[PDB]
Amino acid sequence: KKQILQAKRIRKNRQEYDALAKVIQHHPDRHETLKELEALGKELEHLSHIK
């Protein structure tokens, strides 16, 4: 009884984790966004110097 109460609590925690992770996976990645932000920042600095 005690182990099955703890098991259902851990199952609820896993379902909360999956519920947040599914919403995160509707958004694009993190590191690829950092790479394209670095590229856009370099291009914006070059365009600002040209302007």
Beta carbon nearer to other proteins, 7 or 37: 37
- What does the alpha-carbon distance between residue 45 and residue 51 come to, in Å, rounded to a whole number? 10
Assess 21 for contact with other proteins (CB under 8 A). Answer: no
The token duo for 3 is 């182990």
Q: In which residue are the tokens 């590229």 written?
A: 39
Q: Is the dihedral of CA 9, 12, 14, 20 positive or negative?
A: negative
Binding mask 30-49 for other proteins (x = CB under 8 A): x--xx-xx--xx-xx--xx-
List interacting residues with other proteins (CB under 8 A).
24, 27-28, 30, 33-34, 36-37, 40-41, 43-44, 47-48, 50-51
